[PDB]
Structures are given as structure tokens and as C-alpha cells.
């Protein structure tokens, strides 16, 4: 092979020279530098100590507040969550594995950052299919009289964690496991063999299909469909008596999830793909690692977007940290949202 390849794992990389051995058994210090391996170890912890804090916050804020309750809540809140499930869980095994070069856990801590990872996210995706189909409802209306309540949230977010847990679970019982990528520090899918003891050639196109391909039509369905209703566009102060505004305020930020969900995934996905068609080419160690680890900045956009944009979001995290007992006079046009402040609007 081009590339090398293992009994449980595949090293991109030339073995004329004679010096591969096994990811989990041993360092991989001659695909890079000495310190080279020190940018990931550096990385994670500091995106670590920039992931969690920030989840936790989003975790400790939206539960505690009160008018924070429609599906956009419960949904993003849901991604925090996922996203936290990363930071703490898959992000650590991947620290601790760029801090030695190599998966120091054996086999086992392969599956702890591509079983997060993978979950995560699927999460992050899936969480985009039910916020499509909200704005499919609501807006463009099939049926006028339907709206997505506290019932589909919960049922939405019920439905990300099924498909994420149909994905990154099925590679740990026979089926395609997961190979180190690129340094070998990344974990994910082994698209690089055709390992047919396993079927690796047929379960790649399981998730591929299933998995990705079916959610972006989707997405790009609902936004589609929003050819002529909601078209980028903008408005003053209050509209519907601080409704549609804020309610439009919101579009934005949905249909921006998948803008970011675009930009920090198909530069992996291209790649794992490209490993895929060529089955164990002539490509380095560089060219498929940043692809992975350009990747794992998901468990933080979510967060991100759901503070930068929804003003309604905005003024609630900041009152947590002093408790204070009444609204700025700027405002956030609908009263904002605080803990033991003015979490309230008398509907009109």
C-alpha cells in the first residue's frame, strides 16, 4: 500500500525507510517534529479551557432562566450539552494522546475521540434537521395552525441524540472501527482500507448517505423553500408587537447554524472522503490531521452563535454573574431575561 496499513489501525505514511509501528503501542514522531506534536497537546488544552467554561455557562444559564423555553432554547441548550459531552469527554482522550504523540490508551482511546467526536458531532447536525422543519412551519406554513411547541423540543432533541448514538455506535460491535488519521491523534472512520474482515468498503457509505447527505438537502430544502417568504432582509426596533422581529432575529441565527455547521466540517469530510474513493494512496500525515482537528472546534461555535446573534440570550448569561434587580435601558426590545430580575412581558 501507498499508505500503510495495520490489523486495527492505518499510518499514512511510507515503510520502505522501516519505522511504522502500531499507534497504540507506540509514538509517531517521524510523520513531524519533535515539537510539532506539542501544537495539538498545546491546542486542545487551550481550547479545553475555552470549551468548557463556555458549555457550562450556557448550561448554568438557559435552565436557570425562564422565558428561555421554545424549541431555539431547548435545542442550542441541547447542542451545549453535546458540545460539553466533547470538551470533557472525547476532546481530554485526544489531549492526553497529543501530549505523548500517541493513543496512549490503546485501542480504547481511539474509540474515546471518535466516539465523542462522531456523537457530537450528529448532535450538531441533527440538531439543524429539527430547526430546518421549525422554520418549515412556522414560517413558509403548510398547516397555518401548527407550531413547534415544548413538546416537539423535546422530541427534537430526542431525535438528534437517536441518530448520533445510530452512528458512532454501530463501529463497536464487528462492524467498521475507527484508525488513527493523518499524526495519528485523530480518530475516525477507517474509510483509508477497503478491510472487508469488517466491512469498511460498505459501512463508509452507510453514514456518508444516511447520516449527512439526507440532513444538508434538507436544510437546504427549508431554505429553499424560503425563496420567496423569508428572504435576508431587516426591520426596525419592534415588529408585531415585539414578535416577528425577534422571531426573525432568530431565523437568522438558525439558518446561520448551518452555515458554520458548512464551513468547520466539509473541509474534514472532503478529506475522509478523498481517503475513501482512493483506498490507501500516496497523501501525508499533514494533509488529513488539520482536517480533524480543524474539525473538533465544534464543541464552541454552537455556543458562539447562540450568544452572539439573539439579543434574547445576550442579556441573561451576564446577569448570573452579579444578580442584580432590574433591565439595562437599551433593553433587548422584548425585556430581557435574568435570573432574579425582570424575566417577565404581560402578552399583548
Given at each position: 500500500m501507498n499508505g500503510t496499513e495495520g490489523p486495527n489501525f492505518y499510518v499514512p505514511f511510507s515503510n520502505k525507510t522501516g519505522v511504522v509501528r502500531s499507534p497504540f503501542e507506540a509514538p509517531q514522531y517521524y510523520l513531524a517534529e519533535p515539537w510539532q506534536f506539542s501544537m495539538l497537546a498545546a491546542y486542545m488544552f487551550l481550547l479545553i479551557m475555552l470549551g468548557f467554561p463556555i458549555n457550562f455557562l450556557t448550561l448554568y444559564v438557559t435552565v436557570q432562566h425562564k422565558k428561555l423555553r421554545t424549541p431555539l432554547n431547548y435545542i442550542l441548550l441541547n447542542l451545549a450539552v453535546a458540545d460539553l459531552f466533547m470538551v470533557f469527554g472525547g476532546f481530554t482522550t485526544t489531549l492526553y494522546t497529543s501530549l505523548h504523540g500517541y493513543f496512549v490508551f490503546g485501542p480504547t482511546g481511539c474509540n474515546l475521540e471518535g466516539f465523542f467526536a462522531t456523537l457530537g458531532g450528529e448532535i450538531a447536525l441533527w440538531s439543524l434537521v429539527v430547526l430546518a422543519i421549525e422554520r418549515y412551519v412556522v414560517v413558509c406554513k403548510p398547516m397555518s395552525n401548527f407550531r413547534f411547541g415544548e413538546n416537539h423540543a423535546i422530541m427534537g432533541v430526542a431525535f438528534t441524540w437517536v441518530m448520533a448514538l445510530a452512528c458512532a455506535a454501530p463501529p463497536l460491535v464487528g462492524w467498521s472501527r475507527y484508525i488513527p488519521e493523518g499524526m495519528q491523534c485523530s480518530c475516525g472512520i477507517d474509510?483509508?482500507?477497503?478491510?472487508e474482515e469488517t466491512n469498511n468498503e460498505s459501512f463508509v457509505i452507510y453514514m456518508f448517505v444516511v447520516h449527512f447527505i439526507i440532513p444538508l438537502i434538507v436544510i437546504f430544502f427549508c431554505y429553499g423553500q424560503?425563496?420567496?417568504?423569508?428572504?435576508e432582509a431587516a426591520a426596525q426596533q419592534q415588529e408585531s408587537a415585539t414578535t416577528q422581529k425577534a422571531e426573525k432575529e432568530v431565523t437568522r441565527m438558525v439558518i446561520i447554524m448551518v452555515i458554520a455547521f458548512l464551513i468547520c466540517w466539509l473541509p474534514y469530510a472532503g478529506v475522509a472522503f478523498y481517503i475513501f474513493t482512493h483506498?490507501?494512496?500516496?497523501?501525508?500525515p499533514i494533509f488529513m490531521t488539520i482536517p480533524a482537528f480543524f474539525a473538533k472546534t465544534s464543541a464552541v461555535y454552537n455556543p458562539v452563535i447562540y450568544i452572539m446573534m439573539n439579543k434574547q440570550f445576550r442579556n441573561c448569561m451576564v446577569t448570573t454573574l452579579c444578580c442584580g434587580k432590574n433591565p439595562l435601558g437599551?433593553?433587548?426590545?422584548?425585556t430581557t431575561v435574568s435570573k432574579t430580575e425582570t424575566s417577565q412581558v404581560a402578552p399583548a
Open positions: 474509510y483509508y482500507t477497503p478491510h424560503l425563496v420567496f417568504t423569508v428572504k483506498q490507501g494512496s500516496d497523501f501525508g437599551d433593553d433587548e426590545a422584548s
